[PDB]
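Study both lines:
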Amino acid sequence: RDCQEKWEYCIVPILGFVYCCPGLICGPFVCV
């Protein structure tokens, strides 16, 4: 999908940011 894995970067919500794939939550530092 047009998203990244959970344990990747996960950057703050800005305009046109790259998000982690659905079913993941950004918590520890990255998504999981």
User: Anything to note?
Assistant: The two ends are 16 Å apart (CA to CA). The CA atoms of residues 10 and 29 lie 8 Å apart.
